[PDB]
Design an enzyme around this catalytic site. Sequence first.
Site, PDB file in Angstrom:
ATOM      1  N   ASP A  10       0.838  -1.183   0.000  1.00 20.84           N
ATOM      2  CA  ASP A  10       0.000   0.000   0.000  1.00 20.84           C
ATOM      3  C   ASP A  10       0.881   1.243   0.000  1.00 20.84           C
ATOM      4  O   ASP A  10       1.869   1.293   0.734  1.00 20.84           O
ATOM      5  CB  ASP A  10      -0.934  -0.012   1.207  1.00 20.84           C
ATOM      6  CG  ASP A  10      -2.106   0.947   1.115  1.00 20.84           C
ATOM      7  OD1 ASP A  10      -2.361   1.483   0.015  1.00 20.84           O
ATOM      8  OD2 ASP A  10      -2.747   1.165   2.158  1.00 20.84           O
ATOM      9  N   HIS A  17      -7.434   9.988   5.019  1.00 15.30           N
ATOM     10  CA  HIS A  17      -6.801   9.026   5.907  1.00 15.30           C
ATOM     11  C   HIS A  17      -6.964   9.492   7.356  1.00 15.30           C
ATOM     12  O   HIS A  17      -6.581  10.611   7.688  1.00 15.30           O
ATOM     13  CB  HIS A  17      -5.349   8.783   5.466  1.00 15.30           C
ATOM     14  CG  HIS A  17      -5.183   8.000   4.187  1.00 15.30           C
ATOM     15  ND1 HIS A  17      -4.854   8.604   2.990  1.00 15.30           N
ATOM     16  CD2 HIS A  17      -5.296   6.684   3.907  1.00 15.30           C
ATOM     17  CE1 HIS A  17      -4.770   7.687   2.034  1.00 15.30           C
ATOM     18  NE2 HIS A  17      -5.029   6.514   2.568  1.00 15.30           N
ATOM     19  N   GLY A  18      -7.546   8.632   8.209  1.00 22.61           N
ATOM     20  CA  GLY A  18      -7.611   8.874   9.645  1.00 22.61           C
ATOM     21  C   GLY A  18      -9.039   9.050  10.154  1.00 22.61           C
ATOM     22  O   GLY A  18      -9.997   8.918   9.392  1.00 22.61           O
ATOM     23  N   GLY A  62      -9.395   5.352   2.580  1.00 23.87           N
ATOM     24  CA  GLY A  62      -9.982   6.061   3.701  1.00 23.87           C
ATOM     25  C   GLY A  62     -11.463   5.740   3.870  1.00 23.87           C
ATOM     26  O   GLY A  62     -12.275   6.635   4.103  1.00 23.87           O
ATOM     27  N   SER A 122     -12.452   3.865   6.320  1.00 21.72           N
ATOM     28  CA  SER A 122     -12.689   3.929   7.757  1.00 21.72           C
ATOM     29  C   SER A 122     -13.379   5.245   8.107  1.00 21.72           C
ATOM     30  O   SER A 122     -12.753   6.304   8.074  1.00 21.72           O
ATOM     31  CB  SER A 122     -11.418   3.804   8.578  1.00 21.72           C
ATOM     32  OG  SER A 122     -10.867   2.487   8.577  1.00 21.72           O
ATOM     33  N   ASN A 177     -10.257   0.058   1.341  1.00 24.91           N
ATOM     34  CA  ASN A 177      -9.147  -0.030   2.273  1.00 24.91           C
ATOM     35  C   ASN A 177      -9.632   0.270   3.687  1.00 24.91           C
ATOM     36  O   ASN A 177     -10.374   1.218   3.896  1.00 24.91           O
ATOM     37  CB  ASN A 177      -8.003   0.898   1.877  1.00 24.91           C
ATOM     38  CG  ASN A 177      -7.433   0.582   0.513  1.00 24.91           C
ATOM     39  OD1 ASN A 177      -7.879  -0.329  -0.175  1.00 24.91           O
ATOM     40  ND2 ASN A 177      -6.406   1.312   0.122  1.00 24.91           N
ATOM     41  N   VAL A 178      -9.210  -0.565   4.644  1.00 25.35           N
ATOM     42  CA  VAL A 178      -9.547  -0.390   6.050  1.00 25.35           C
ATOM     43  C   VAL A 178      -8.266  -0.512   6.870  1.00 25.35           C
ATOM     44  O   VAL A 178      -7.591  -1.537   6.797  1.00 25.35           O
ATOM     45  CB  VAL A 178     -10.590  -1.410   6.553  1.00 25.35           C
ATOM     46  CG1 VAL A 178     -11.323  -0.880   7.773  1.00 25.35           C
ATOM     47  CG2 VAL A 178     -11.586  -1.812   5.476  1.00 25.35           C
ATOM     48  N   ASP A 179      -7.977   0.525   7.668  1.00 25.49           N
ATOM     49  CA  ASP A 179      -6.808   0.559   8.531  1.00 25.49           C
ATOM     50  C   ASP A 179      -7.200   1.075   9.914  1.00 25.49           C
ATOM     51  O   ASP A 179      -7.234   0.300  10.868  1.00 25.49           O
ATOM     52  CB  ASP A 179      -5.705   1.422   7.928  1.00 25.49           C
ATOM     53  CG  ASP A 179      -4.457   1.502   8.786  1.00 25.49           C
ATOM     54  OD1 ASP A 179      -4.294   0.606   9.633  1.00 25.49           O
ATOM     55  OD2 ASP A 179      -3.675   2.490   8.625  1.00 25.49           O
ATOM     56  N   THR A 180      -7.501   2.379  10.021  1.00 26.30           N
ATOM     57  CA  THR A 180      -7.698   2.995  11.325  1.00 26.30           C
ATOM     58  C   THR A 180      -8.836   2.318  12.088  1.00 26.30           C
ATOM     59  O   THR A 180      -8.630   1.876  13.216  1.00 26.30           O
ATOM     60  CB  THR A 180      -7.954   4.498  11.226  1.00 26.30           C
ATOM     61  OG1 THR A 180      -7.036   5.014  10.267  1.00 26.30           O
ATOM     62  CG2 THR A 180      -7.772   5.191  12.556  1.00 26.30           C
TER      63      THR A 180
HETATM   64 ZN   LIG Z   1      -4.776   5.113   1.297  1.00 27.47          ZN
HETATM   65 ZN   LIG Z   2      -4.103   6.803  -0.854  1.00 31.71          ZN
END
Ligand SMILES: [Zn+2]
Ligand SMILES: [Zn+2]
Lengths: 276, 276, 276, 276
Positions: free
Chosen positions: C82, C172-173, C201, C203, C222-225
């Site tokens: 990523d 993002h965040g 982003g 999330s 996409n999943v992160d936070t």
């Molecule tokens: Zn991203």
């Molecule tokens: Zn990006």
Amino acid sequence: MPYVSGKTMIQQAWKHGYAIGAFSAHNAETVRAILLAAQEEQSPVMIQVGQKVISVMGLKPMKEIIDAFMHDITVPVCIHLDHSRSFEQTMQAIQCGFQSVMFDGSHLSFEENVRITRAASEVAHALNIGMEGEIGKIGGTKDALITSCDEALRFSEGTDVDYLAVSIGTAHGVYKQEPKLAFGRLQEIREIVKKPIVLHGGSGVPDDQIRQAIALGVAKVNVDTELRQAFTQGLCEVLTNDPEEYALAVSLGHGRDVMKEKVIEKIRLFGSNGKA
Amino acid sequence: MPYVSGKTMIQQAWKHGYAIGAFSAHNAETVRAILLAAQEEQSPVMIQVGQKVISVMGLKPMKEIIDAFMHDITVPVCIHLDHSRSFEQTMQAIQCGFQSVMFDGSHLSFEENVRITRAASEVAHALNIGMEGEIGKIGGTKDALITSCDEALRFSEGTDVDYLAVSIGTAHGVYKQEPKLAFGRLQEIREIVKKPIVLHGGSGVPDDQIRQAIALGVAKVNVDTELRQAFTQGLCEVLTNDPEEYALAVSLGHGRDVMKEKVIEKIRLFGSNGKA
Amino acid sequence: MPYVSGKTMIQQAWKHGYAIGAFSAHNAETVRAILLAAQEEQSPVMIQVGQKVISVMGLKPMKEIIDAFMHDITVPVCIHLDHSRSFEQTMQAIQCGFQSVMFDGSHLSFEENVRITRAASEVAHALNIGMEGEIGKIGGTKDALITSCDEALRFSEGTDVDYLAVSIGTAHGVYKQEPKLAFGRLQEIREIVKKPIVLHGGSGVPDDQIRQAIALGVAKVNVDTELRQAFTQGLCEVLTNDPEEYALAVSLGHGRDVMKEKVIEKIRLFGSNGKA
Amino acid sequence: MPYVSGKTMIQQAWKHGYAIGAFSAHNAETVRAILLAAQEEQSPVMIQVGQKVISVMGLKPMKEIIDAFMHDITVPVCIHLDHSRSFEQTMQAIQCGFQSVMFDGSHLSFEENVRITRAASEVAHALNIGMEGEIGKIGGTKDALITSCDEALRFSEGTDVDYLAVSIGTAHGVYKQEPKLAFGRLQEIREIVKKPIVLHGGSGVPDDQIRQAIALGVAKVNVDTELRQAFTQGLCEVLTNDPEEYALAVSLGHGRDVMKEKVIEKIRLFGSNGKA
Ligand SMILES: [Zn+2]
Ligand SMILES: [Zn+2]
Ligand SMILES: [Zn+2]
Ligand SMILES: [Zn+2]
Ligand SMILES: [Zn+2]
Ligand SMILES: [Zn+2]
Ligand SMILES: [Zn+2]
Ligand SMILES: [Zn+2]
């Protein structure tokens, strides 16, 4: 990936009245020949790694060569350590993930044979690995003295091997005179011991006999020399017809193909074709 | 473990006025022969995996066989993809960790050769992999037309290869008539291009010439046929003296040993003995 | 073993109107959480390895940790690099067998973004690896300037990426203020570009919107936070209720389980549950 | 690569009057913390994989995680299976290449403890693996009953373990009341048994005592809880000061660093710093 325990593989063959071929490999082409045959025949197979090759190439290397040729192989394969006369060596092959092993204590007394075979069998069972042992010295190509039905029983009970090798008329190498099996002993062992039998020195046994032996509970037939005869009949045809042929894909490639045929022959004779 | 980048390995050889041998392997024994020689000679070496073997055994398998025989090897080894005419194939060998690669666009126009060699060289540099390319079609054993000093320059500048293969009198296979190198072109390229040179078809080049070429900046000498001649002179001696010898440790073992000698010969000729 | 190309995986999702979740992992528990969820849900999944974790653990280590947890996993998994801003790094992940990669040139000019994305995409296609790129800078939680329908077209055509990331209202965040997507742009891109879209982003995007975006051709979310929120809501509950609990199987085990839930939530939201 | 047998590693420590730390790992950060410490301290170390983590992550996974973090590690590392109460499990860890193992039969009778420890020790010696056993039940944090000097002798002779764990005042977990070692028993065992000693439950033993124990032939000190205390004192500081910190590189990164310190402390206390 499609590596299958030898306990599982011999048992199925036994239950359903076929034998699995144990084909000794010595190098790359030979390994591939074997794997090609089996795949073309939708047959489970055992690749045997024995003391001779081990001294040339090594245990760990030869396992890794087999691993390297398994990419397109969908049928059941089991890697078998043959005629190990050492606990360390037996323990080494386990450690690099052989799926079957044979501790040969036939040259040891009953007590010592049993003691070590048992020790190795305890380890093998622990990690789901087919275990073979031998009672009765099998020669290599002059009255007579075979394996007792009772010796077999005690050996089997004391060692808890998955498959038993008995001395029953076979021998290692190009047979001098057509031998003859003790189908009778086989009958008794079948009933007494209730365990699959391994026939050492099946290279040069008439087909009739092989199928008769498979009928009396033989589920593993070892093949080595016949395969090397074939591989060498290949190297030769090419090499003695054209000595200035320097392409190893031809000279040894034809060694391979001819040996591929020999395997398929045996797979059929043993009746495992179809059984994946 | 002791796998060393080919940029590093050819450069050192160049700086210090020796050439590294690029020995083509085709199977296990051959791989081992090569690794045995090098180790006995405390010499860095390149094992070459070329299009012929790739079609028999496969890229990934042959890398894994080499990996399998590296356990006792302490000297610098680099695995080299030879005569790749495909970006995909070049990308595949990188992916399974070859330490050098050659994209051969000699059969493509200048523009297209340069475009792809560059693309592959960008990837190789990215992952610290020696990169070879070719300008000028090298034949396989009738006026004359060699490689320009200027073609070389532009090719080298446009592609940023680490080592350049030029057509300079060599050819692939058993040489019909003792050839002769353009030591002059070599002189010019040495001064203009400021990059190590690879000599294809060094099997059958008189020693005098080889050492002369190494003096004019050749740092990589490819060896294939001579090694297969030797391996086949081994299989033969044994097989035509005794056709009923079925032990592959002897028939092909003697193929190996004789080929082990041939390597050591070349290591010495190239002057890498001692250089680990 | 059940590692599937990302071209294959996103395309199927696209064709059949679901999106695949790209779940960022940072350590062992997180990797396992993700793999557990997917398996319990018979869902294909992507594990994302991003620049943050890469600096902590490293590329190669994190791939190997994922490999280690794949033993009991039967569903399709794809490993995704990523937000790579480096060709070398993109080339490294390919070399250790990622099944998808994203080169993010959003901070480069159109020409340079395209030039490198193309270079990396050529390599990825060569080895059957899903390829992602980005046109339009996506921020990290003040007028407005989104991605053109035409920029997208040219980018897509010039780079031949498999899936395109566009700037369309995400960031993002932990979102400060509930954002809103350009479903309209999505409509146009769907018709013009004829390629799957990636939403960075996701999330903190309301579910309604996510399913609406998946309807307009988003096939990768996409999943992160959100996942780290959950994992940290786990560590906390345990740790702030009992600070003298020293068993990492509980404190971080509960971090895992809670995060396992979060994944399953998203799998369902994206509609991939069932699709293995 | 720099994986060293535990027989070799404990023996050297013994001969030269230092002890090696056996640090229990539970996940990635913990594994790395340990490896970072050791490397910064040029100290040999043992990473312990025990029954708790095994139930969370698994044997094979955790070995592979350790393998993944060994890329930049030049010092001697040994992987140790801790408190195995199963022959199968002992055999499994051997099979995936642990360099030391402990079979704990302390809950079995003398005869059965000895029988299995011996069986496992025979295998370990065969493949050059450090072997530990226990005589005397060590508790987990009310008269008194320690380990006999004679029990120890017979156990040691019967099992041929490389290093012996005796019950001598330690216990597992956060110690309720400062315990006290039988330095006397240690003296006797040192002279009678002529073998290195392992101290279980060295988390919470005053330093004075540890160094005194190392003087009486303790060459392996197990550390688990103290390390998890530290790791959890890290997670906490960050998490209870900022609960909305969602970056696992910080919250658990600080868990790591603090635990890295704790290891270095112990390395020094045990006196292995310098000894690579
Ligand atoms: Zn991203
Ligand atoms: Zn990006
Ligand atoms: Zn035999
Ligand atoms: Zn035999
Ligand atoms: Zn050539
Ligand atoms: Zn050429
Ligand atoms: Zn303990
Ligand atoms: Zn204990």
